[PDB]
Amino acid sequence: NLLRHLKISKEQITPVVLVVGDPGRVDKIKVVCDSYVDLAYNREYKSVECHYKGQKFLCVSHGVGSAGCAVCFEELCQNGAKVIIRAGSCGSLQPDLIKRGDICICNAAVREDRVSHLLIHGDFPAVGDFDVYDTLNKCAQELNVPVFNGISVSSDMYYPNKIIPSRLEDYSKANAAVVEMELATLMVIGTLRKVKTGGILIVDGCPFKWDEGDFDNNLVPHQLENMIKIALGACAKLATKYA
Amino acid sequence: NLLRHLKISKEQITPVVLVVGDPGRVDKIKVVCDSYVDLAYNREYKSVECHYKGQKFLCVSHGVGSAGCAVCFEELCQNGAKVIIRAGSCGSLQPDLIKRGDICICNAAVREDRVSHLLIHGDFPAVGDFDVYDTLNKCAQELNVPVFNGISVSSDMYYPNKIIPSRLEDYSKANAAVVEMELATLMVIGTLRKVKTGGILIVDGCPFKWDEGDFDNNLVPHQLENMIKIALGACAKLATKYA
Amino acid sequence: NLLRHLKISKEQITPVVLVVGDPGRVDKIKVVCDSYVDLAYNREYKSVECHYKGQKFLCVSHGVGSAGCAVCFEELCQNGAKVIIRAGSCGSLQPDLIKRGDICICNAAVREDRVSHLLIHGDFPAVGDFDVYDTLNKCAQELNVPVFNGISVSSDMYYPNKIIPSRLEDYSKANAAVVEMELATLMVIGTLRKVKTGGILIVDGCPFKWDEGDFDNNLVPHQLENMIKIALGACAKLATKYA
Amino acid sequence: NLLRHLKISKEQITPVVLVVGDPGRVDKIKVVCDSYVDLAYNREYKSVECHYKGQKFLCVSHGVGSAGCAVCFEELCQNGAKVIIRAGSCGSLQPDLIKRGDICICNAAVREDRVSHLLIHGDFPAVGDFDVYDTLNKCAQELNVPVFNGISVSSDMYYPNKIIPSRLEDYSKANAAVVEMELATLMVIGTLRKVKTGGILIVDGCPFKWDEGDFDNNLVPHQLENMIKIALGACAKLATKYA
Amino acid sequence: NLLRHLKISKEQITPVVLVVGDPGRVDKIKVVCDSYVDLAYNREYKSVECHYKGQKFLCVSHGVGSAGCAVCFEELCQNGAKVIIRAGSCGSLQPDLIKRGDICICNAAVREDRVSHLLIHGDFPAVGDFDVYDTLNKCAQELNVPVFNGISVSSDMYYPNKIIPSRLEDYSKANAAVVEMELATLMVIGTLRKVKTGGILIVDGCPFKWDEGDFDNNLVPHQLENMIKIALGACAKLATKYA
Amino acid sequence: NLLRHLKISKEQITPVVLVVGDPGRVDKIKVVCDSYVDLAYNREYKSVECHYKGQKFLCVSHGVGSAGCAVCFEELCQNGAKVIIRAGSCGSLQPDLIKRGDICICNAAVREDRVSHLLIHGDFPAVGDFDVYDTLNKCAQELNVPVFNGISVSSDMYYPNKIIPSRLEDYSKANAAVVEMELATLMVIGTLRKVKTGGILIVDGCPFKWDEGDFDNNLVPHQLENMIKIALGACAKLATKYA
Ligand SMILES: Nc1nc2c(CN3C[C@H](CO)[C@@H](O)C3)c[nH]c2c(=O)[nH]1
Ligand SMILES: Nc1nc2c(CN3C[C@H](CO)[C@@H](O)C3)c[nH]c2c(=O)[nH]1
Ligand SMILES: Nc1nc2c(CN3C[C@H](CO)[C@@H](O)C3)c[nH]c2c(=O)[nH]1
Ligand SMILES: Nc1nc2c(CN3C[C@H](CO)[C@@H](O)C3)c[nH]c2c(=O)[nH]1
Ligand SMILES: Nc1nc2c(CN3C[C@H](CO)[C@@H](O)C3)c[nH]c2c(=O)[nH]1
Ligand SMILES: Nc1nc2c(CN3C[C@H](CO)[C@@H](O)C3)c[nH]c2c(=O)[nH]1
Ligand SMILES: [K+]
Ligand SMILES: [K+]
Ligand SMILES: [K+]
């Protein structure tokens, strides 16, 4: 009776789920909660049940990239999840404004994947749910953590080559705030499946400035802590509606 | 020195602008305000300076369809508008839930135009400003007017032919709430020009059921009055910030 | 029951219709006819019954842009129109040859809209009826009015941004003569609905040279007069075969 | 020093060129002229100088299909041809109206090739020159040969498979008259190179009814001689202008 | 210092790399080697140095999906890998011929990802190196394991929805043998980076018949043993050239 | 009765067919055989039965370009051909490595045609049969003829214009070795029709350096002899498996 990739049962799926890319990040989140229960670890998908401020919700890793995260999101969305919040990292597309360590809460995303397009026509928007977005912003100000807001580029390409020009500069000029690899996919899947979604992200560098060393995948520790508390806060607040 | 199509000067543009498709609707709105100043009327573009709740904002008609409304929106965005709210009509894509005369406040749109695509790659989301969306919803709530929230399909096709299948049913299945013709264009132009946008829409029928007589372009009178009140309410609230 | 946007009845549609973008141009035209009858004015759609040289035909405004004019053209084509001639303005794409105030009679157009693509695959030509084209040229010759002939770019973008390159220069290199916003839409809708179409256009400037001040939307009055007489001449000649 | 595939020199190219697909057709045409001179025959490209009604023009075969005919057309257009008329065969897409052996003179074409798209954006129309079209029509009238006029589908696919549906029926519904494989390519190359083009075509069958035996590769003898006479007629009329 | 996601140094990269999607599979493979050294485990990327039949090559997991595996493959290809073989699972697209547990060695793949398209135009083939394909086939016959050969569909969609039809049936009709999620990405990256690639795959079910219960995540043990033996045999053969 | 374009019967079709672009090349090949029998010559399609090393196989010309050669390949594949090897010319895309007169044996091709796309989606690879490739290579080895292996660009454009950039440079950077016009079309049709295919090509120049005079379609005589002997050798070896 188990889900194919998450290897947990439908009965173990909570109304609220916090997803992250890195399985290691699940272990850092779970030790911040009041208690947890380890559930499964299959491939890159690590699932834990988090207990926080009297509420119960899953934390699950989805892996790097849209195709792999989509299998995670589908398994969640078709088996009872109502709210999914991604807490991720990102690169900055506004290096004058948004620096390594900064936190962005994103309402919408650029669909530079394939899987969303195999689900719905390209003209359809990757947009998060306002309530999820609103509660992430509200927790951040309650915790007195400055955050940015904007659009994320969700791109399937991490290492550009020099044949086809990358569109990242185009999107920067179009006022996209940040870039990562999974948010647009989450948003689209959630819209199609009537699941509310949201996204909060921590800058790990600037892809325009990698050749200058503007990169470190060791996330700024006090900001990673801040982001986590914001995410956990939002999840508990949203979970109360369904408990 | 007048704007090419609006035929008003740059100094006559206010921070907040309420836009509608029908130039006749501009006259319905202006008489509900505390007072107004008729500014110009050229082609389909009628501009009026509205005074409401101690605030000053333009109401400008943009005409039918994305290419013609983009001309209006560019003229506003490039000459000082900071917030643009579209108060339009729409068809229902959820005839079971959303009926003639109902009001939808939309946060995002399907880009079934061409202009947006001539401006930015298709993967980029047509999304409204979530703070405009919030204001609109809060005004509706304070006026005790039930509203729907959701994605609008903005389609350049009004009259389908029999050769190419229309994607309207696909988008209904994807959970799009309504269909009109301008919102996606406003949203994308706003995002590119750093202008906050939003959309409130009144249902005039259901396109899947036109052949049953489920259409009346005389908009339901008290609901149109309600939508206008909401739009005017939101405009004056937003205008206070730039005053 | 009236047509939804034209608000005239099926019985008021003549075999031949002259269409223009600007409702203010309907008044310029009707005034050089032997007589006329005002029919309706709804949104940007002004309809007038023109009497000229013993014939009867409508003059109707279609508004700015492909989506809004498609609504007009479909209401006409599905309710009796057999010949539609657009008398519009355009920009020059050949500034060394075609100058402000010149008249172009176009046989074909580039489909840079969306609505035609929602009707028929992009590979399909936007092409005018060759007899309508011939009639327009012949009337111009009888009136001793020099004209140009060639392809029009019908583009949904009037105000380009600086992210995606505009294709206007590519089309100029491909020998397109002029640029407007409605003609390809008319042509395609006409071909699909078995309605004969054509277009005559007066140059208002050159979009490659707008920043040199090569623009004035006050059309050169003696050339506007000339284009109207050519257009009216052609409508009456064509209307005789349906009278 | 010769053209690469035609194996004739630039000075052997005349202002007017008649092109056909089948090298065998070149020999059927040359025999009807007042006299001729064989020039070359390389690959599928046979070139003959025709003398007819006091004029001289080349007759050149282009072979089957857009990529190979484009080599021929580029070598003509870049080396002095001012006018190119394709006299070809075609399938009927309107079996009730256009029968085996009927003649169609086409003004435009559907671009279902690739080479035109490698030259100019898809939205660009494949359209013939009016004077060429007019001349072909007038010669048919003088010879009392009944003809049809319409749009040709130029498709790179002759034998459909069962995976991707053919667009022929779509185009039939869209009112395209006939189907062949070279005309759109000629038209686009001609427009780009400032060469006047046109097409006259003889029906050899109906692709919707091949399984019922509505196909003969042996062209109706008196209609072929009729089509050849119209084309030879038109080439001589047009050649007079450049002589 | 270290590769961003693999977390190993340039100097630890061997000429030959065996890649698998599942980190758990790396543990099953190292066990059958003569010996090994655990190198690193970060995210879904587990790396192990294999010692087999006198030769040294890496075994690295790439995770589920094109965008995630592309990160792995790029880090390998730009830091000295010369040969990469993917040893994965797949679904069958020819259920009448290729059944659960069967092994397929694939020469080419369908590019239903996004990342390959962000590197090179869609018309470019996803193809493996013939020598790698030959080696794999030669190793299978020597070990006496019957294998299938064919094209793999690499698709970013694992769980189809009901809006856009899946292309799997089309590709089955086109004679594609199997489906997985990464091979096309590997092939294209390798071609671009001058790295020889190949793929060997074990059938885990048939997506056409998942609702018939034709699926098991547990790959049949004696066939997984066989595949790994082939793969390990091939890697050692290929390693000898660069030693 | 006869195939429509080849004008031979189903019973004259052999299991193995050597195809060439130039009807002239069929005559060059047949006289190197032990004997032959002329079958048919219609349009650009010359057909000859070749007797070589105790085997019997067709040699058939397909003309220039993808649409015309698809006509040939479909007639062959649907009427009993099992193996088809193209022996063609090509231009070099690696002018510092691959020179005029060199021979390349290709395993895959870039699908820059239209017809393949009207048969199967663009994501599908144009790939040759790996046994045919192996046989061609082993024949060259045994005849001591040095060859290159690689991907060919199959392009419908021979003469680029200056509006849309040619992708040849992009494909050179992507490591494609040569350019011709028909190989991708053969490969895709073969895969769909379950016919083994392959390609051997002789370099006639470099398209990047045509303006330097780096081109001669008079193919280097001893290398053309070498290519033919390789081609004939492989056809005979492959024919033994069906005889
Ligand atoms: N595309 C992209 N994604 C990211 C991310 C976010 N995730 C980090 C991980 C790859 O390092 C993927 O799961 C996406 C951080 N920085 C960047 C960047 O510069 N680019
Ligand atoms: N596409 C579409 N738009 C609308 C609208 C909205 N506007 C009404 C006007 C056309 O009637 C355009 O400005 C769009 C109302 N109902 C519908 C519908 O059924 N369809
Ligand atoms: N796109 C475009 N259209 C026009 C037109 C034609 N119409 C004028 C009006 C916009 O001013 C639309 O209805 C299109 C004149 N000049 C130009 C130009 O420079 N560009
Ligand atoms: N596509 C297509 N072309 C044609 C043609 C025209 N030419 C005939 C020849 C293929 O037989 C090509 O040069 C195109 C006649 N009938 C048909 C048909 O049914 N289909
Ligand atoms: N798309 C797809 N992939 C696979 C695979 C191969 N991998 C298994 C894993 C998803 O379970 C991905 O890394 C791809 C096995 N079966 C199937 C299937 O039915 N479908
Ligand atoms: N596209 C292309 N094809 C070729 C060929 C191969 N064939 C030669 C003939 C046109 O010259 C077509 O059948 C393709 C040789 N050289 C070249 C080249 O430089 N370019
Ligand atoms: K309009
Ligand atoms: K040919
Ligand atoms: K992954």
Side-chain angles (χ1 to χ4, degrees), chain B residues 38-105:
Chain B
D38 276 338
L39 259 33
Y41 190 13
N42 170 250
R43 293 172 175 277
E44 50 266 56
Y45 313 106
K46 184 184 287 218
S47 298
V48 167
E49 190 191 288
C50 298
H51 305 296
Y52 189 72
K53 297 280 196 271
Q55 230 43 50
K56 179 195 162 163
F57 50 88
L58 307 186
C59 182
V60 181
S61 68
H62 54 61
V64 173
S66 56
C69 79
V71 163
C72 173
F73 303 154
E74 288 288 2
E75 289 185 11
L76 303 169
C77 291
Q78 286 188 63
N79 295 283
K82 300 287 188 302
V83 177
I84 303 172
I85 305 181
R86 172 164 144 75
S89 59
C90 64
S92 174
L93 302 173
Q94 304 297 336
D96 292 350
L97 202 78
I98 308 165
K99 275 91 178 295
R100 206 161 56 77
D102 291 332
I103 291 157
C104 191
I105 294 179

Side-chain angles (χ1 to χ4, degrees), chain A residues 13-30:
Chain A
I13 292 181
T14 54
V16 176
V17 184
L18 180 68
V19 304
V20 296
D22 189 342
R25 197 142 74 235
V26 187
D27 292 343
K28 287 179 202 145
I29 295 168
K30 75 179 182 184

Side-chain angles (χ1 to χ4, degrees), chain D residues 4 44 64 75 158-159 217, chain F residues 4 44 64 75 158-159:
Chain D
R4 294 177 179 188
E44 55 267 51
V64 168
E75 292 181 9
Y158 182 94
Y159 291 115
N217 229 176
Chain F
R4 289 180 180 188
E44 57 266 50
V64 173
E75 291 187 4
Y158 183 88
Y159 293 115

Side-chain angles (χ1 to χ4, degrees), chain A residues 129-187:
Chain A
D129 169 281
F130 168 80
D131 254 296
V132 175
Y133 173 83
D134 197 32
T135 134
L136 287 162
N137 285 328
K138 285 206 203 175
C139 296
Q141 52 151 51
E142 293 184 13
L143 299 169
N144 288 273
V145 185
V147 294
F148 293 83
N149 305 116
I151 293 156
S152 183
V153 179
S154 301
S155 178
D156 280 11
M157 193 175 56
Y158 185 89
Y159 290 114
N161 214 135
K162 67 214 73 154
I163 304 165
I164 293 193
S166 153
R167 284 168 176 188
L168 281 179
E169 186 180 352
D170 283 349
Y171 289 133
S172 178
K173 289 184 180 164
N175 298 307
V178 297
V179 60
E180 42 79 74
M181 301 179 73
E182 299 91 8
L183 193 61
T185 294
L186 171 60
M187 277 165 177

Side-chain angles (χ1 to χ4, degrees), chain B residues 21 44-45 62-69 182, chain C residues 21 44-45 62-69 182:
Chain B
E44 50 266 56
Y45 313 106
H62 54 61
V64 173
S66 56
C69 79
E182 297 89 358
Chain C
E44 55 263 61
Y45 309 105
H62 57 63
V64 166
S66 63
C69 78
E182 297 91 3

